[PDB]
Amino acid sequence: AAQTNAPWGLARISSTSPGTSTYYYDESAGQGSCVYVIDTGIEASHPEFEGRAQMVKTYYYSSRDGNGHGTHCAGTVGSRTYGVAKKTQLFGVKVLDDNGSGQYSTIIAGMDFVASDKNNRNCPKGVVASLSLGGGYSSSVNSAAARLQSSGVMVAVAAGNNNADARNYSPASEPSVCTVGASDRYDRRSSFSNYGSVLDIFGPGTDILSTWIGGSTRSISGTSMATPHVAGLAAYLMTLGKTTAASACRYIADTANKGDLSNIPFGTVNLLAYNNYQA
């Protein structure tokens, strides 16, 4: 399948070169997979989600996304126009308040929730969790992410936006999950992207168009935007049967575009997520 005039990041993930604008992908499109977006919520009524999104858990007075961040990330995973995996099922877990903030204890509870809640959902092709959030190093936060991964969920986490080594941030620094840095449309490391040996992969993160609350759209930047590209890619590849939740991060690194990014510090992987789809 070909989506013309796609957001640059979608075109990038199906291309061996920057500077194109058509996204190419297998029509299976993540059907039969599920992606949990652990964030500020998801505006599931947005026409872009086509009935495939739902809130399953909140720790606050509403499950609604009063911020937009979670809706934007969910749109990059799986919206019809802005999403990588256009037929996946999206499940929202609201661990962040409408200012985008959340206590680590709530975030940990949300991760353990997903590890159990997947047993209440139909995801024959597999389960992914996208975590566009983080703070300072916490062994308890890292352990929660490790448990979620161990339970059979492909966990993708943002590297962080400090232009610093991600070893000092959580859950970015957890070795067993997929830690995602951000790149721009010219294949440069995004100016804010964290780096370091703990990164597994880069995805598009600068000037990413996606869904927003109020049935709208906007372009924003962050490792929060790169993470759902990788989460959606994992769901897409799992639906194709090419990999599993336990092996998807390694498979994405195996099959990435290699050596194409600029300003990658010595010791950080130079790997850009790529679907290897041959139309």
Out of 3.40.50.2000, 3.40.1000.10, 3.40.50.720, 3.40.50.200, the CATH code matching 2-272 is 3.40.50.200
CA distance 104 to 52: 28
CA distances (Å), origin 269, targets 44, 150, 225: 35, 24, 19
Binding residues: 16, 175, 177, 200, 260
179 phi/psi in degrees, rounded to 5: -95, 125
User: Which structure tokens are listed for 62?
Assistant: 């509403």
Annotated resolution, angstroms: 1.0
Where are the domains positioned within the chain? Answer: 2-272
Report the helix count and the strand count for the chain, using DSSP H and E: 6, 15
| Catalytic residue selected from 97, 151, 224, 229 | 224
CA distance 159 to 157: 6
According to the entry, how was the structure determined?
X-ray
Length of the chain: 279
Instruction: Give the strand pairing for 53-58 and 23-24.
Output: unpaired
Cα dihedral across residues 216, 221, 222, 225: positive or negative: positive
CA distance 162 to 45: 33
| Catalytic residue selected from 39, 97, 98, 165 | 39
142, 48 Cβ separation under 8 angstroms: no
SS3 35: strand
- Catalytic: 46? no
CA distances (Å), origin 30, targets 59, 61, 70, 113: 28, 32, 20, 23
Binding residues for Ca(2+): 16, 175, 177, 200, 260
| Catalytic residue selected from 46, 69, 72, 229 | 69
